From Swiss-Prot, chain A:
Contains 2 ubiquitin-conjugating enzyme family-like (UEV-like) regions. These regions lack the critical Cys residues required for ubiquitination but retain the ability to bind ubiquitin. The gene is Babam2. Keywords: Acetylation, Apoptosis, Cell cycle, Cell division, Chromatin regulator, Cytoplasm, DNA damage, DNA repair, Mitosis, Nucleus, Phosphoprotein, Repeat, Ubl conjugation pathway. The modification Phosphoserine is found at residue 2. This is BRISC and BRCA1-A complex member 2. It is found in: Cytoplasm; Nucleus.
UniProtKB/Swiss-Prot annotation, chain B:
The lineage of its organism: Eukaryota, Metazoa, Chordata, Craniata, Vertebrata. InterPro entries: BRCC36_C (IPR040749), JAMM/MPN+_dom (IPR000555), JAMM_MPN+_peptidase_M67A (IPR050242), MPN (IPR037518), MPN_BRCC36 (IPR033860). Binds 1 zinc ion per subunit. It holds the Pfam family JAB. Component of the ARISC complex, at least composed of UIMC1/RAP80, ABRAXAS1, BRCC3/BRCC36, BABAM2 and BABAM1/NBA1. Component of the BRCA1-A complex, at least composed of BRCA1, BARD1, UIMC1/RAP80, ABRAXAS1, BRCC3/BRCC36, BABAM2 and BABAM1/NBA1. In the BRCA1-A complex, interacts directly with ABRAXAS1 and BABAM2. Component of the BRISC complex, at least composed of ABRAXAS2, BRCC3/BRCC36, BABAM2 and BABAM1/NBA1. Identified in a complex with SHMT2 and the other subunits of the BRISC complex. In the BRISC complex, interacts directly with ABRAXAS2. Identified in a complex with ABRAXAS2 and NUMA1. It is found in: Nucleus; Cytoplasm; Cytoplasm, Cytoskeleton, Spindle pole. One of its GO terms (molecular function) is polyubiquitin modification-dependent protein binding. This is Lys-63-specific deubiquitinase BRCC36. Residues 5-150 form the MPN domain.
Curated annotation (Swiss-Prot), chain C:
Component of the ARISC complex, at least composed of UIMC1/RAP80, ABRAXAS1, BRCC3/BRCC36, BABAM2 and BABAM1/NBA1. Component of the BRCA1-A complex, at least composed of the BRCA1, BARD1, UIMC1/RAP80, ABRAXAS1, BRCC3/BRCC36, BABAM2 and BABAM1/NBA1. In the complex, interacts directly with UIMC1/RAP80, BRCC3/BRCC36 and BABAM2. Homodimer. The phosphorylated homodimer can interact directly with two BRCA1 chains, giving rise to a heterotetramer. Binds polyubiquitin. The gene is Abraxas1. Belongs to the FAM175 family. Abraxas subfamily. The chain holds residues 3 to 324 of 407 of the full protein. Keywords: Chromatin regulator, Coiled coil, DNA damage, DNA repair, Nucleus, Phosphoprotein. It comes from Mus musculus (Mouse). This is BRCA1-A complex subunit Abraxas 1.
Length: 383, 262, 312
């Protein structure tokens, strides 16, 4: 059952907990982001009417994998704490001393279940390490990264059951990278009701051997970041060199991703300064503009009772390349039926200018060039 | 045709205790209740009558119109005693070590009973299912009716939604029905012995052997049925005394809470 | 190599199922009985085995716990009153405990494992059992229901399933009754059987053992009738008292129930914090006629979050 269908079936006294959990999306860092509620049952006499369901199964994405945990409430006793089942992972030993939000269970906070489940995943991480330690060799990396809190404490880990043949272990580390993605721009989705989620960059590293050989790195990006940096298929990553050196590999990807993000957000902020200055100056006659990326603007002006339009197109390399102006007549179209227009790209400009100076020089260029364009449009164009 | 079935847990308990009584044969009984309309045609089952099967054998389950006469007499008696509008509305049998689904013979019998009235419904209880692979036990129940096929005869099954109505406490009717099981078992053994004695010209040591068999059979009946049933009733009386004390404590607590508050 | 069979009576399972079906939620309780150690009296086998032992657990009665968490907290800690409470439920010997979870997988939960271990500790019975029942409905049509039950016991810290059997009349009643006369042309055999027939074959036909057993059965049947009357009266008293308690609970909850802008705050706070002094007058209101601004007082005091750069 999709979440938009499930949130209508849950007992009302319990709906807020699951609502907060779903709306928060993910629990830890997840990577796959495939959070869902699947099996949902009444857990009460079949003749109890209206919204009633309180048992369910939760798919928690964790370290590129998915944990299938059953969670149980009782509708007729909503105040009471939940109960948990960890699917086929019987060996899981959760220390009840670390579950502060479960020890001090309080329906008074709708986030309680989330705070519980979140803490439970923190124990599950540690539990994986307990199994992981029994494989040896790889702790040399875990320990090395644990001594770096900014990476170690923003981390998740998984280790696969022993191979029936050879007895090898598969393992995966997942890291949240500490870069300032806060100024990454937005972009509108088809559904709109969709949420891109927290703008974050996750580094997944997988090992097939019980040693530091044949290692597969992968970089997952929040949809906002992927859209800002021009798509995952348009970015390369340093391949894993060999041996054991995550502490020297992660800083390289962090430095490079920060470089690219700074370049693109600098371009974005300069385009925003341009559009902001041009709005401040000529907003009285704004027609349209790209409020999401600041790559386009379209203004309507009047010269001696004759209307005309100007389209400003800003290139990716805006601070360096000149923005293209396009003057258009509102009365004349050309012989081909297309709109009569003339583009200006070679004109007074300096990349060192700010928004205000560019607006001043643009108004000057308008006053100086509009008569030429209008004479040409009367000479060549047809009504 | 019926559209839903509500069964009083009061009677579901009698049915279940009848089903778990024996694994060596299939057992059967009839279901008394009423037809109702609400929100849809529904059958409310209030009580059941336990019946003795004579022919036995696998899959050969039928109720005699004699048993129907006895059941309709009991239905009228209960309707006058309780003031309820009770008619014989259904039947049930047990499928031990067998899937809960009806056999083609079960469905043909359900159709033969629907010929009386299309409002008749059937129940089936699947008892002890053994599975050392899973090492778990299971017990199921289902309700059904029958429909004439598109082709000649060959009736087909159809499912009926069934729910259990939480009857928080035991009705006396269900106790008076549950205590009939030992009586019926004893009467079955006694009838077997009486039919054995019909050929009076028989060996004396053989009669001693048959008497010993009768005594051993009733000893087994008392050790496995009457004894555990009586233990259950004593345990229930103790449970009810403790529950009465707890509920009296809770009543006094709520009386104090409402007197002191507002 | 040890086995631990679990044993029930049809009626006990029926009573547990009934107590559950009456409860419009999960429920739980304790299982009382006796544990007997027997040495597996090998069948076939040889003098080169390690002869298994069966710890047969006989469940005789159950005590239902009328509310959840009556004897434990969120972390499965039992607390001391729980001991007193299970003693107040005057008892003989505990052997296990049961729980009904409507629609759930047959695998004991986090709380159940911790609680079973804590109960084994506090009751000093490291051979307790856990009876988990999951009732469920199949086919969505609610035409067919399935009650799946299993026993659990700790072994290697992990809990493993244990077999369960329900005692019934079918267990080797083995009706015989030999027909066809074993007639012998023996004068001596006939003379002896006939001489010693009177000794218990009775007079005017019949047999004394038949009547002894019939009288015993009739006595037990009248005992059942009397206990049925007394249980019916106890049930009537329970019904009345329960309706009273439920009415008072309804009154309690009712008495307790009856006894008890859309402006851009973030934008205004960000605008005031980004232009302290200077012009300040910048607000979100303007004159509809001429392009002159109207002032707004805002909240000016709300707690701001995510205060971030205007241009890099
Ligand atoms: Zn059948």
């Amino acid at each position: 059952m999709s979440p938009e269908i499930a949130l209508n079936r849950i007992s009302p006294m319990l709906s807020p907990f699951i609502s907060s959990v779903v709306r928060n999306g993910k629990v830890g860092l997840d990577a796959t982001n495939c959070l869902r509620i699947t099996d949902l049952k009444s857990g009460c006499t079949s003749l109890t009417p209206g919204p009633n369901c309180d048992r369910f199964k939760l798919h928690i994405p964790y370290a590129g994998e998915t944990l299938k945990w059953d969670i149980i409430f009782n509708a007729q006793y909503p105040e009471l704490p939940p109960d948990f089942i960890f699917g086929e992972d019987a060996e899981f030993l959760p220390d009840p001393s670390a579950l502060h939000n479960l020890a001090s269970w309080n329906p008074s906070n709708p986030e309680c279940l989330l705070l519980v489940v979140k803490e439970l995943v923190q124990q599950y991480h540690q539990f994986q390490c307990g199994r992981l330690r029994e494989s040896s060799r790889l702790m040399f990396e875990y320990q090395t990264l644990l001594e770096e809190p900014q990476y170690g404490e923003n981390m998740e880990i998984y280790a696969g059951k022993k191979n029936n043949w050879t007895g090898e272990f598969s393992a995966r580390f997942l890291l949240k990278l500490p870069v300032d993605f806060s100024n990454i721009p937005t972009y509108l989705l088809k559904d709109v009701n969709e949420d891109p989620g927290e703008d974050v960059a996750l580094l997944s590293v997988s090992f097939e051997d019980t040693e530091a050989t044949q290692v597969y790195p992968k970089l997952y990006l929040s949809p906002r970041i992927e859209h800002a940096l021009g798509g995952s298929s348009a970015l390369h990553i340093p391949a894993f060199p060999g041996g054991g050196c995550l502490i020297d590999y992660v800083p390289q990807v962090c430095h490079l991703l920060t470089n690219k993000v700074q370049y693109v957000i600098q371009g974005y902020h300069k385009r925003r300064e341009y559009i902001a200055a041009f709005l401040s100056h000529f907003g009285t006659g704004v027609v349209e503009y790209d409020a999401e990326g600041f790559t386009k603007l379209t203004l309507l002006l009047m010269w001696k009772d004759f209307c005309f339009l100007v389209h400003i197109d800003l290139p990716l390399f805006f601070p360096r390349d000149q923005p293209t102006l396009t003057f258009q007549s509102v009365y004349h179209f050309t012989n081909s039926g297309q709109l009569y227009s003339q583009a200006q790209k070679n004109y007074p400009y300096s990349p060192r200018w700010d928004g205000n100076e560019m607006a001043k020089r643009a108004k000057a260029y308008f006053k100086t060039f509009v008569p030429q364009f209008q004479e040409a449009a009367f000479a060549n164009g047809k009504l | 045709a019926v559209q839903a079935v509500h069964l009083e847990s009061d009677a579901f308990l009698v049915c279940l205790n009848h089903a778990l009584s024996t694994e060596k044969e299939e057992v059967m009984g009839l279901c008394i209740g009423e037809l109702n309309d609400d929100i849809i045609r529904i059958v409310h089952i209030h009580s059941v009558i336990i019946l003795r099967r004579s022919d036995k054998r696998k899959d050969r389950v039928e109720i005699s119109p004699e048993q129907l006469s006895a059941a309709s007499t009991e239905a009228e008696r209960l309707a006058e005693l309780t003031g309820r509008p009770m008619r014989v509305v259904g039947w049930y049998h047990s499928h031990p070590h067998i899937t809960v689904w009806p056999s083609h013979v079960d469905v043909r019998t359900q159709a033969m009973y629907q010929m009386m009235d299309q409002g008749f419904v059937g129940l089936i209880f699947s008892c002890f299912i053994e599975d050392k692979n899973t090492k778990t036990g299971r017990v199921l129940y289902t309700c059904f009716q029958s429909i004439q096929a598109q082709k000649s005869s060959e009736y087909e099954r159809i499912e009926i939604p069934i729910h259990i109505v939480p009857h928080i406490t035991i009705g006396k009717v269900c106790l008076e029905s549950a205590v009939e099981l030992p009586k019926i078992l004893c009467q079955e053994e006694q009838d077997a012995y009486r039919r054995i004695h019909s050929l009076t010209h028989l060996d004396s040591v053989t009669k001693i052997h048959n008497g010993s068999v009768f005594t051993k059979n009733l000893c087994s009946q008392m050790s496995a049925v009457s004894g555990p049933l009586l233990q259950w009733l004593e345990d229930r009386l103790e449970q009810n005394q403790q529950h009465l004390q707890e509920l009296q404590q809770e009543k006094e607590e709520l009386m104090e809470e409402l007197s002191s508050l507002e | 190599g040890e086995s631990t069979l679990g044993v029930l009576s049809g009626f006990v399972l029926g009573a547990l199922t009934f107590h559950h079906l009456n409860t419009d939620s999960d429920t739980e309780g304790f299982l009382l009985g006796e544990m007997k150690g027997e040495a597996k009296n090998s069948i076939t086998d040889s003098q080169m085995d390690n002869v298994k032992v069966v710890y047969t657990i006989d469940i005789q009665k159950y005590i239902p716990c009328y509310r959840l968490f009556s004897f434990y907290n969120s972390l499965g800690e039992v607390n001391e009153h729980a001991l007193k409470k299970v003693l107040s439920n005057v008892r003989k010997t505990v052997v296990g405990w049961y729980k009904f979870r409507r629609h759930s997988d047959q695998i004991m939960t986090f709380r159940e494992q911790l609680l079973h271990r804590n109960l084994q500790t506090h009751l000093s019975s490291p051979e307790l059992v856990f009876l988990l029942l999951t009732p469920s409905i199949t086919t969505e049509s609610c035409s067919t229901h399935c009650l799946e039950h299993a026993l659990y016991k700790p072994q290697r810290g992990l809990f493993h399933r244990v077999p369960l059997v329900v005692t019934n009349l079918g267990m080797s009643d083995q009706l015989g009754y030999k027909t066809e006369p074993a007639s012998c042309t023996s004068t001596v055999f006939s003379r002896a059987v006939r001489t010693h027939s009177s000794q218990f074959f009775n007079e005017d036909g019949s047999l004394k053992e038949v009547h002894k057993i019939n009288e015993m059965y009739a006595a037990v049947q009248e005992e059942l009738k009397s206990i049925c009357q007394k249980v019916e009266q106890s049930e009537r008293e329970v019904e009345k008292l329960l309706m009273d308690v439920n009415q008072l609970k309804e009154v309690r909850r009712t008495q307790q129930a009856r006894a008890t802008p859309q402006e851009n705050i973030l934008l205004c706070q960000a605008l005031r914090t980004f232009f302290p002094e200077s012009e300040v007058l910048h607000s979100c209101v303007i004159s509809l006629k001429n392009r002159h601004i109207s002032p707004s007082g805002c909240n000016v005091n709300h707690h701001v979050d995510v205060v971030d750069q205007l241009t890099l």
